[PDB]
Design a protein around this ligand. Structure first.
Ligand code: ZN
Ligand code: ZN
Lengths: 80, 80
């Protein structure tokens, strides 16, 4: 198996989150990845439907930051 | 002054990078911010043309990661 993002070797699977899990559609992980990358994340994929914790930590940390920035910008734009 | 991203109080300016600097246009900082956020970063801005190191560390760390991911995806998509 391979990490969908970094495409590096997956050791087993307990370094990894499943992007999708069986009778999939709707993931949260997929939704976050779609927000920050230019390619698509879909149930099928010849590539992979797993992401290593190393990539997920970087994406989720950035997303948490990104969400804080959106909130500050929203408040500023809606205040006199 | 205020951080263009988090809109929090700028202490002085040595916690901050100038997004733009005098006879501006072309920044690298602006270019990276434009890649990861939904609003525009421009010389004028009623808002601010400075970014605190706290925000810049988060953006630049993510961007470095993002660049590594693009490279892996490019190689995969161009290899048999
Ligand atoms: Zn990875
Ligand atoms: Zn900031």
């Amino acid at each position: 198996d391979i990490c969908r993002l970094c495409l590096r070797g997956v050791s087993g699977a307990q370094m990894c989150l499943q992007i999708f899990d069986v009778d999939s559609g709707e993931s949260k992980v997929a939704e976050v990845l779609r927000q920050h990358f230019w390619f698509e994340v879909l149930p099928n994929d010849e590539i992979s439907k797993v992401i290593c914790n190393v990539c997920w930590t970087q994406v989720s940390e950035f997303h948490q930051f990104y969400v804080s920035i959106q909130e500050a910008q929203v408040i500023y734009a809606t205040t006199s």
